[PDB]
Amino acid sequence: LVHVASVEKGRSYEDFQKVYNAIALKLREDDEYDNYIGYGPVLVRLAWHISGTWDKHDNTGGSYGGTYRFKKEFNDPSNAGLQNGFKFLEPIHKEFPWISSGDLFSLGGVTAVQEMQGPKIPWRCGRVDTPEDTTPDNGRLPDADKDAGYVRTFFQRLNMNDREVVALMGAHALGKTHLKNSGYEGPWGAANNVFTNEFYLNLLNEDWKLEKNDANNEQWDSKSGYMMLPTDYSLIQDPKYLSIVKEYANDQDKFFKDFSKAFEKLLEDGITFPKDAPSPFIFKTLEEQGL
Numbered sequence: 001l002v003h004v005a006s007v008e009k010g011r012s013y014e015d016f017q018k019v020y021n022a023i024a025l026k027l028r029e030d031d032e033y034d035n036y037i038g039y040g041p042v043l044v045r046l047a048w049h050i051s052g053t054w055d056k057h058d059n060t061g062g063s064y065g066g067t068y069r070f071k072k073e074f075n076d077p078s079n080a081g082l083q084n085g086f087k088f089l090e091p092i093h094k095e096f097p098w099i100s101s102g103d104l105f106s107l108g109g110v111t112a113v114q115e116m117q118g119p120k121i122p123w124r125c126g127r128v129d130t131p132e133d134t135t136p137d138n139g140r141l142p143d144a145d146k147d148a149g150y151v152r153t154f155f156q157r158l159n160m161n162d163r164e165v166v167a168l169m170g171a172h173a174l175g176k177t178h179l180k181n182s183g184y185e186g187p188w189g190a191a192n193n194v195f196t197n198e199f200y201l202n203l204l205n206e207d208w209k210l211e212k213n214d215a216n217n218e219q220w221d222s223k224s225g226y227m228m229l230p231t232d233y234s235l236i237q238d239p240k241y242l243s244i245v246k247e248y249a250n251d252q253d254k255f256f257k258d259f260s261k262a263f264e265k266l267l268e269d270g271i272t273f274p275k276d277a278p279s280p281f282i283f284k285t286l287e288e289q290g291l
């Protein structure tokens with residue numbers, strides 16, 4: 001399986017920048033979502049989810065094909081709740097019908113992070129919609145009630161190392177868990193719609209208590225009213241993970257750099273970019289454009 005990136009016929013950066021701006025303006029506008037958290041978080045998760053089905057062994061899954069659009073994938077239990085992100089993007093697609101789905105879903109994640117003050121994430125266009133037949137089976141996304149070994153092992157299927165895994169998890173600073181969706185309830189911190197290294201700080205600074213939730217699943221709860229999943233918690237249980245956690249807890253700048261590289265890598269896994277492909281684009285935020 002080779003997936004070669006193919007730029008949408010006749011589109012350029014400017015064309016992409018417009019899609020980014022539309023998503024961004026909509027984020028600004030639909031602020032009531034999830035008790036005022038906004039759609040930022042859910043969009044980041046959607047980009048991560050359409051990309052985490054990848055399997056470096058046979059190259060199936062990943063963001064290329066926009067398969068989330070198909071029922072099999074759309075209805076995946078690990079995908080519960082993502083439908084709101086989809087519905088959010090729907091009108092955007094309508095406005096820019098020449099964009100491929102994989103490109104739109106991935107770009108929403110990038111837009112979200114950057115509009116939430118995170119770092120700039122270089123992005124590449126070229127993903128091609130593939131047939132229903134290419135939809136990966138459910139079951140490729142990770143479980144939350146496990147430990148560091150599980151996590152390490154899991155991430156390897158996506159080619160990510162320790163550092164990448166820790167960086168990537170800092171996305172947990174965003175949004176929250178919802179009982180109805182995953183069987184977990186509560187946010188990971190306080191500034192849940194602003195991109196910061198809060199996640200590491202919390203994991204190292206709170207006094208966490210293991211308890212069972214209303215869905216009968218365990219979670220680490222803090223006095224502050226925050227929570228951590230077993231997998232999140234495992235980052236302080238593993239020696240190697242822990243020191244990276246501390247490093248991020250100490251230098252937000254490091255964290256942003258590392259996050260940036262990993263997220264792009266994550267969204268580009270499984271895709272082959274020809275020599276003549278344009279370089280990655282770095283989009284301007286609304287603010288940088290005075291919009």
Ligand code: DDH
Nearest residue numbers: 041042045048143144168171174175176177178181182231
């Ligand atoms: C072991 C892991 O790999 C993993 C597990 C397991 C795991 C399980 C959960 C669960 C459970 C939920 C809550 C769902 C709900 O009830 O609504 C959930 C919420 C959010 N994810 Fe996550 N995630 C892990 C990795 C990543 C990564 C890498 C990312 C990333 C890089 O994007 C990222 C981004 C975000 C975001 C943001 C949310 C909050 C969504 C929301 O708020 O609606 N997560 N994640």
